[PDB]
Structure formats: structure tokens, C-alpha cells
Amino acid sequence: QTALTQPASVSGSPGQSITVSCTGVSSIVGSYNLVSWYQQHPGKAPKLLTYEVNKRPSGVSDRFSGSKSGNSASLTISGLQAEDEADYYCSSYDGSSTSVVFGGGTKLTVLGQPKAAPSVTLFPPSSEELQANKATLVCLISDFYPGAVTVAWKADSSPVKAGVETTKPSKQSNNKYAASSYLSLTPEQWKSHRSYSCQVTHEGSTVEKTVAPT
Amino acid sequence: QTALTQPASVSGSPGQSITVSCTGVSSIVGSYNLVSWYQQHPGKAPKLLTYEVNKRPSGVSDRFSGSKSGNSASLTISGLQAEDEADYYCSSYDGSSTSVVFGGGTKLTVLGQPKAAPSVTLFPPSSEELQANKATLVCLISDFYPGAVTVAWKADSSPVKAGVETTKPSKQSNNKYAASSYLSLTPEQWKSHRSYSCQVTHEGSTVEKTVAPT
Numbered sequence A, B: 001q002t003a004l005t006q007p008a009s010v011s012g013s014p015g016q017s018i019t020v021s022c023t024g025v026s027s028i029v030g031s032y033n034l035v036s037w038y039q040q041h042p043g044k045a046p047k048l049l050t051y052e053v054n055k056r057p058s059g060v061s062d063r064f065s066g067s068k069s070g071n072s073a074s075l076t077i078s079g080l081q082a083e084d085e086a087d088y089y090c091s092s093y094d095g096s097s098t099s100v101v102f103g104g105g106t107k108l109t110v111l112g113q114p115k116a117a118p119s120v121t122l123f124p125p126s127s128e129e130l131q132a133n134k135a136t137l138v139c140l141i142s143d144f145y146p147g148a149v150t151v152a153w154k155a156d157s158s159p160v161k162a163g164v165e166t167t168k169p170s171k172q173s174n175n176k177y178a179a180s181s182y183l184s185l186t187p188e189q190w191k192s193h194r195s196y197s198c199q200v201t202h203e204g205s206t207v208e209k210t211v212a213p214t
Helices: A127-131 A187-191 B127-131 B187-192
Strands: A009-012 A018-023 A035-040 A047-050 A064-069 A072-077 A086-093 A100-102 A106-110 A119-123 A135-144 A150-155 A164-166 A177-185 A196-202 A205-211 B009-012 B018-023 B035-040 B047-050 B064-069 B072-077 B086-094 B099-102 B106-110 B119-123 B135-144 B150-155 B164-166 B177-185 B196-202 B205-211
Touching: A009 A018, A018 A035, A018 A086, A018 A106, A035 A064, A035 A072, A047 A064, A072 A086, A119 A196, A119 A205, A119 B127, A119 B135, A127 A135, A135 A150, A135 A187, A135 A196, A135 B119, A135 B135, A135 B177, A150 A164, A150 A177, A177 A187, A177 A196, A177 B135, A177 B177, B009 B018, B018 B086, B018 B106, B035 B064, B035 B072, B047 B064, B072 B086, B119 B196, B119 B205, B127 B135, B135 B150, B135 B187, B135 B196, B150 B177
Parallel strands: A009 A106, B009 B106
Antiparallel strands: A018 A072, A035 A047, A035 A086, A064 A072, A086 A100, A086 A106, A119 A135, A135 A177, A150 A196, A164 A177, A196 A205, B018 B072, B035 B047, B035 B086, B064 B072, B086 B099, B086 B106, B119 B135, B135 B177, B150 B196, B164 B177, B196 B205
16 A cells, blocks of 8 residues: 555664654645654554644643654654653645555664563462362563563472463563463372472573462 | 544454444544544554445455444454454544544454353462562463453452553463453552452453452
8 A cells, every 4th residue: 555654663762862754745635734643552542642743632742743844744752761662653634645644654662771670479379279179370470671581380399391371471551561470280289299489581580489388 | 532432342253244333433523434444463554444434445355344324434344254353443534633533443353262251360469478568469360262351450349440450461372361460569458458359351241259368
């Protein structure tokens, strides 16, 4: 399809400014100045940031400002924050097609954020669960950055070969990532070891928690 | 709440027809017939399926058809295929901001196995945690399909907001989904009540587990 031209990606550190360009805006029939910019976070609807080139909706930070220069429009994000990581799109009312044309989208990554080792909380199977004749261990991994981690489980000091499920890390409200891993065991297995452990490796550093029947 | 509203999610089987509807198009000033539907697959840019209510651009299968009746517009997909699983957004031109406004999106699942309700296991704060003056409860939600759920926390019979985080449903190895919702609260607050409840809602049904400090 046809689209306005935007760079595929941009990146900057907190506090910096990023300007995303959008070319091909000039309306053909008429001299429309109808350029808008939208922000889209994963799995959510695009949200309007600016319209009519430089007007901003209420609710939108003044760190976002739009401008135009001939056949090109720009969105400048001032004082970048980790929450700005998202896809950004411009749109323009084209006159040549009599309709609205969108840009191809620009993915924005906020680099230079501070490394944060994960917090690890390990929960043994509860009495309630044992009454149902099942035993599940949950290893909660939170507030780490960057968002990549490796999780390994041990029964005493030996590697656990089965029953492990670990979720893909997701960015939470504080811009750090969370994930959980759970190990499904039979109560016999749970009771036949002195302890079980969750080992979480982040950026080459390993954090480990252990828990035992009681 | 928003200018355009549509269901958070819907599911259908391969071969069937399904219709997703958006309401609010007539309330938008200057929308006329500028109603579009977009399909968006994870990580990809949104793809335009229909515009001007019922026209399809080049390449879009005639399995997709848009319609409009009054204050609602609908996208009907016939002969549902697995590649149709994706997020769908309606949008409309909005003369008040000379911008396009989008509906909130509908997550469409093309059923590939029977619907499976969530396994919900709730864990009270571990002792290691308490001795470290922290109290996090975790609501493990596993093996559900379709991969969409809503969770509600209740400290006694009072809903809770603050301190809640929930990972984006992640797909397990058994092809079902899993996620955990954790409530971080101070040990004091943990004692303060007699119980906490995790209320998971999946495909209409809302299962609930409750734990007690003991």
C-alpha cells in the first residue's frame, strides 16, 4: 500500500530528545495542513498525540510536539522516558487520493536505562493445594532490566528435567520486567527432597532462592 | 469511554463466519462513511482491510467484508482461517481533530483446540518474604485458552487497585496460556485483613480463589 515515509526505528536515552520525520505529507488537492501523530503500545489502540500539525489533545504531555516543513512533518519527543517506548505513526490527509494516508510506523526504543537485577520470590505449594493432591512451586521474577532472563530449577542440588513452564517477560507499570516460572510436582516428589530451588540468571549474574516442605 | 467501542475479544472455529462490531461511528462529527477496519499481527504494522465502510484495497480477500448500520459498523470474516487470528481495530475519520480515531481493538482467536478454563492457584506470602518485611501474593493462572483473561483482587470483600501487576498472557508448551497476577503489599496490610481473593474471569466465567493469613 501507499504510506507516508518514516524511519523504521529510532532510539535514545532518558532525558534525550528524538525527532521522527514523516515525508510525503503535502496534500495534493488543496493545501491541507492536517498532519497527526499517534503512539501505539503493544496490544493497545493507537492514541492521538498531535493533530493539525501542532495542536495537542488534552491529556497529552507537552513533551510531544509536532511541526511541519514543506513535504515533511516531524514529531519531537523531548525528555524521553522509558514509557515512550512504543510505535509512532503519522497520518496526513492526502488530496491526491482524497483519503487519509498513514506512515509505515517507527519503533522507538529507550536505551541506556539502568540495569536492575531481578527480585526473586519463591513460593512453596500451599496446604490448600496439597489437600488437592497437587504441589506447584512458583518462582516470581520481578523488576529486572533488561528484559531477558534464564530460569533453572533444582530438586535438592540436581537439575529438574520436567514440569517447568516459564512465561515470557512482560514490561510492567514501572518499566521493569516481570515473569514467573512454575514447577508442577506431585506431593510425593515435593516431600521426597530436602528442598527445591529456582535459579534466575540475568546478564550473567545468578540469583537463587530455596524452599523446603514444612 | 472512547469514541469507538468494540468487544475486547471473540473467538470462532476454522470455517465459520464471525462478525466484530464497533459502536459510536455516528457520534463522530464529520465521519461520514470514512470507517476502516485494520488487522494487526504481533509485531507487524496494522494492515488496512476495509475502508469507506465496504471497499477492500488490493490483495485483501473477499472473505472480509465491512458494513455499517446506524451507529455501528461491523467487519465480517467468512471461512475463518488460522492466519486470521490477530487484533482487529475499527477506526473513523474524526472531523473534530482532523484525525483518525480508533476503537479499542478486538483480540480474535481462531479456535485450534477446545476452550480451556484457567487453573488458578493462589499463594500466600512466603515466610522468607515476611521475615524480609514484604508480602506479595501470587495468583497463578495457567492452561487457559483462548489466551485472554481479566483478574480482580479483593482484600476481604473490598476490591483492590494499588499494588497489582499482571503479566501479559504467555503461551505455554501445551499450547495453552499462562500468566500470573501478583499483589505486592506490606506485611502489616497482609495481617490487617482476614482474607484476600483472586477473581479470574475467562470466557464469561469468573473463578475465584481466596487465601487467609494463618
